[PDB]
Amino acid sequence: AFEDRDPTQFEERHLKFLRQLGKGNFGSVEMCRYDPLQDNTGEVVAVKKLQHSTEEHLRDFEREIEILKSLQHDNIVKYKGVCYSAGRRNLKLIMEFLPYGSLREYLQKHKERIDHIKLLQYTSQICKGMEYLGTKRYIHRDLATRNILVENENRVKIGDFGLTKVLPQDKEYYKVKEPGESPIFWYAPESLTESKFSVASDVWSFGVVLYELFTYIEKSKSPPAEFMRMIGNDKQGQMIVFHLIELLKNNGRLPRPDGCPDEIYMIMTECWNNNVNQRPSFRDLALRVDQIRDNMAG
């Protein structure tokens, strides 16, 4: 006999690998087919797992599963459950599968069909998704277009939370000392220099996402491609970070993309203020971006 009081627990035997969606360092995301009937009646899902797990990495993963479970918003990827695989001696995270993939590969593939008002719609939704996290005191710490997913032409969702921190009620930022390479060209200056993270540091990285949208993910226009151009293309290793910090702290910034409206470029530069306290909130950005759209609606 069988009684199911928990549909969030996926059975590993009925869960079948199809192709890799994303592969990192200590993690990986797969497209899977789940068939509790095995005649193929079950959902296509997305499954995250650990690779080169530490005991420390598993404790983080359990925390990231908690985070994602705590979130219900039209612009946050849907949690579906967990699978305790390897006969209950392993943990994996099960999520909805969004057919269009990450915003990055979508905008690179369909960059002709996607006009400015459209880029503005996805920008607004990323903002709302982030204002929702801030209501929870969550710090994302990794906004870039590869971590944003496209459910269809008119909706995107924030779709990874592997670095997400939860601020205590007492504090306004999270200092996190961590080993290994960081996405330095998306990082706020205080994040580069003091490992400090906050809603304001996510605001910074948001400005870079907006830049990425307005360059239509063109490789020669990308943040590292344009920063390396300013730092010097020949720089290697620690030297780059030294120069990137010095360039940022003296107000050097990414250029306005070809064809990007000044008012949209201006939003990027407000996001990139060295003064954490002069960065707009995500509520301010969603409101500005929606009024811009509405003034381009009629």
Ligand X SMILES: c1ccc(CN2CCC(n3cnc4cnc5[nH]ccc5c43)CC2)cc1
**Residue 282, annotated ligand binder?**
no
Smallest distance, Å, CB 138 to ligand X? 17
Q: Residue 69 annotated as binding?
A: no
Tell whether residue 94 is a contact of ligand X (CB under 6 A). Answer: no
Using CB under 6 A, which of the segments 117-125, 133-141, 146-154, 264-272 binds ligand X?
Answer: 146-154
27 touches ligand X (CB under 6 A): yes
| Among 4-12, 18-26, 85-93, 119-127, the segment contacting ligand X (CB under 6 A) | 18-26
Minimum CB distance to ligand X smaller for 184 or for 247: 184
Residue 24 binds ligand X (CB under 6 A): yes
Does residue 146 bind ligand X (CB under 6 A)? Answer: yes
- Binding ligand X (rule: CB under 6 A), the pick from 131, 160, 190, 226 is 160
- CB distance 65 to 93 below 8 Å: yes
**Binding of ligand X at residue 147 (CB under 6 A)?**
yes
* Active-site annotation holds for 142: yes
CB of 243 to ligand X, least distance (A): 28
Catalytic residues: 142
By CB under 6 A, name the binding residues for ligand X. 21-24, 27-29, 46, 77, 95-98, 101-102, 146-147, 149, 159-160, 162
